[PDB]
Amino acid sequence: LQRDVVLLITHSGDYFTIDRVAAALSRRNVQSFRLDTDKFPMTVKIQAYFHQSNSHHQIEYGDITLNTEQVQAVWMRRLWQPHLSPELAPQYRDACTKESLAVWDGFWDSLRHAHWVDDLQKINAAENKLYQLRVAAEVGLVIPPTLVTNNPKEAREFFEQVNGKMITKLLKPLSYLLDAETLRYCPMVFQAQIPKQQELRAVYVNGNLFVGALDASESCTWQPYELPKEIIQHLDQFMARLGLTFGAFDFIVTPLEEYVFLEINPTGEWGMLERDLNYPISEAIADSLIQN
């Protein structure tokens, strides 16, 4: 009962990113507790006690017991779902997956005093890509002209506005140990193709930028880049509006040096950038967790 623990929320097969951040946290002599969400409900134990004004919540994992009142910060790195056991009666499987997810929901409310990087309700709202396009334009970023629709007849005829210089995109694609399949039966998002000089992955941590250029003119060769201060000002405003300390952006830089917002992934991967270019992303994250 006293706030000095940083709760690291990820899954059991998470490596490099979780390790480097954990190591940076300890280098400030701050305690951390690694919680593998996939190890619940079969290994992790939850207790949530409600009695009129008094509450009590604790989690047990790897034989270490953590009371939620010891938590000053949450690093919301990955929320995987519960591994409910091979075999097991299918009639129980979905009732107890859905049941174990509601437990997770109740658990976060007990952690409302910790400083979250990032708030889960904020992450979920920011995953709304049409909302993303609104906020990007509202803070002054260029966005590609985009049409959302089911009627193939407009997209047709939007495609014949953009002069065949059109792309199709999944709203909730395919990232959510490997995936990849194409939906050519439910296209609903169409964007103008934007003249491309470079593709950027810009990792935002609490106002710090770490950008890789994929250069079109884990993914292959990443080239170091700096964003102009004006672009960073736009992301600062953008992130404040989404309520996010951390996020991974996808930008196209045009031949006229315009920076076109494509999307943000609030929980997008960053280890590749720290790995290939030695960006100190793990230290920026660790510093934002104890900065509250």
Next chain:
Amino acid sequence: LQRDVVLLITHSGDYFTIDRVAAALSRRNVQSFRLDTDKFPMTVKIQAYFHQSNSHHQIEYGDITLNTEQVQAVWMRRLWQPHLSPELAPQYRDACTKESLAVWDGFWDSLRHAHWVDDLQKINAAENKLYQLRVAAEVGLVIPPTLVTNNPKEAREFFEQVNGKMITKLLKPLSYSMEGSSFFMYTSTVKEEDLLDAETLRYCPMVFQAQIPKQQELRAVYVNGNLFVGALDASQESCTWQPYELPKEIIQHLDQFMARLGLTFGAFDFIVTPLEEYVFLEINPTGEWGMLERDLNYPISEAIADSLIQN
């Protein structure tokens, strides 16, 4: 160029409540637009265009075109799964349910200026039953002692704590109905079941509560400060609803609770004890109410119609 339409969000198989609300709205000379969410994407046409700070959104359903700037209020009655599958597909079916839900998600953001009953994010947060118990306890409602756990060792100490008078319930119940009830039946717990190692219980966390002496079980529909309460009566039986009226001090607490949740509408489940204590059990933010309007002649649809046009 006239924001005066009330958008009714439901599905094609909804029937009694949706009609009553529309009729109440039109008797107030207010246009309404009933949007059947399940009829998207195969029948409803959505169009949203985004160009550098300027955006435009429209819906067409049943040969009526709705522009989102004409909507003054949104009634969030039911948000259904998108219906695909005349030509039923496999694993592609769920991917495009996900695609179609994101379109609706983009679409709700365009209606953020309208008066929602209720706001979807507020509904989503209020569906957290553990969150409910804290807020109820903070605004002065009596709540049952509660444990949520997959730890069989703590379920046993809780059972001793409440002196062996304890019930179990699933947090997210498995029933015929979507978002099931709080008492169309639940299980009383004797110590053999706690001992019964844990079964499922360490991979199926449960809710354990102190058993509360019940004189009546109430479903109290809260509409914008107005209460409509029915008491459930047996006589495998034949459940009927009959009327109840809440003390104004509980209604004052119910006002505080709903303000904290940012909700205008909800369906409460209360136990009234033989010593006439009112014990909060849960709220269903999208709970059914048509039963009460029909069986008890509560003018719920009138109260809903009024909260939508009061803005």
